[PDB]
Amino acid sequence: YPDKTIHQLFTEQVEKTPEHVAVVFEDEKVTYRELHERSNQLARFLREKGVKKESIIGIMMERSVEMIVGILGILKAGGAFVPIDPEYPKERIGYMLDSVRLVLTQRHLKDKFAFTKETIVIEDPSISHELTEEIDYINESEDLFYIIYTPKGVMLEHKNIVNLLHFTFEKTNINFSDKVLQYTTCSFDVCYQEIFSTLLSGGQLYLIRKETQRDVEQLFDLVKRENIEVLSFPVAFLKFIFNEREFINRFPTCVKHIITAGEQLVVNNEFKRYLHEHNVHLHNHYGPSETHVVTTYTINPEAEIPELPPIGKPISNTWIYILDQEQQLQPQGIVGELYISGANVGRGYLNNQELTAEKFFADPFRPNERMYRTGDLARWLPDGNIEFLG
C-alpha cells in the first residue's frame, strides 16, 4: 500500500480527473479541480491561523460541499480533524473540544454554540482570497487523520485509513469511480470510508440533506434518478427496509454494490430474493473505530445466501486473532475475543493512555505489529471466515 497521506492521494486523483464531478449536492456539482482549489485556499487560511503538523482541529458543519472542503483543507494544512455533530448537546460538544486548536464551522453553527475555543467560519470571505495553487504537504503516513469520539476520542492515522482504502481498490470491484451515496452521519467512521473511497478513485460523491437522509421515500428515489450504483447503509437500516413491504417495493434495483456495517447482518428471504433477482453484491464489513473496517465478506448473489453472513476475512496487512482470557489462540469453532493487528490499528485514545494500555497491546505473534482488543466475541469457521457474535 502507498506510504501516502489521504490528501496526497486525493491530489494525485485530481491530476487524473480534474474536470470530473467530485461532489454532487442537489443543484451544486463540484469538480475535482474545484474541490482541490477550494480546499487549497482553506488550507492556506488554516496555516495562516496557526494550523501546524498534527494540530487537532474541530470541524462542525451540516451535510454540505463546505464539509468536504473543510475536511480536505484541515488535512492539507497538516492537521487532523475532530468531527462534531451540529445536533449534539452543547455540553457534549465541550467534551470534544479537548486539546483542539480551533473549530472550523459554518455561519449558523458559529451562532448556535458560542464555542469556548477559537472559531473559523467556512463562509469567511478572507478564505476565498488565498491562492488556489498547490501547497507543500507536511504529513507523514503515521500522522493523525482524525479523532472520532464514541466518551473517548479514538485516534486514527493516515496509514490506517489508507490501508483499508487501498485494499478496497485493489481487492474489490466496487465501482467507487461511479456515483456513490454519502449516507452515514459525519460522527461515524463509515462516513469517511464513503467519502474518501469515492474521492480517491475518481467517483461522484452524492451528499444529501439531513431531511432526505431521514426520508426513506425521498432517499430511494434520489438513487433512482441519479443511478447511484454504490450504496452504504448501516445493518439496522437494511433490516428496517426488508421488514416492510412498502419499502421493499420502492428499494432501488439497479444498484451494483451495497456496503453494510454494524450489528450482525440478518438477510431474510425477501432480502435474499432481492440480491439474487438483481445481481446486487452485498458486502459485510466489520471493525471498531479504533481500527476501522478490517474484515470483509461479499455475498455472492448467484450462490446460496447465508441469512447470517459471516464478517469474512482480514483485509491486507491485517491479522485477526480469536483469543481466550489468557490471550491464547482458540481452536476453530470456539468462542473467543476479537483482537485486531496490523496496518489498521490506530494510535489509541486521546489524552487517556491508561485506557489505551488496557486495549492496545504488542502483537505476540508478529512483534513489529500493534494489537487492539475489541471486546467482541467471534468464532473461526472451517473456511477461514470469522463468525461475529457480539
Swiss-Prot record:
Coiled-coil region: none
Record region (Domain 1 (proline-activating)): 3-390
Domain description: Consists of four modules, and harbors a putative thioesterase domain at its C-terminal end. Each module incorporates one amino acid into the peptide product and can be further subdivided into domains responsible for substrate adenylation, thiolation, condensation (not for the initiation module), and epimerization (optional), and N methylation (optional).
Function: This protein is a multifunctional enzyme, able to activate and polymerize the amino acids Pro, Val, Orn and Leu. Activation sites for these AA consist of individual domains.
Subunit relationships: Large multienzyme complex of GrsA and GrsB.
Family: Belongs to the ATP-dependent AMP-binding enzyme family.
Protein name per UniProt: Gramicidin S synthase 2
Species per Swiss-Prot/TrEMBL record: Aneurinibacillus migulanus
Gene that produces this protein: grsB
Residues of the full protein shown: 465 to 860 of 4451
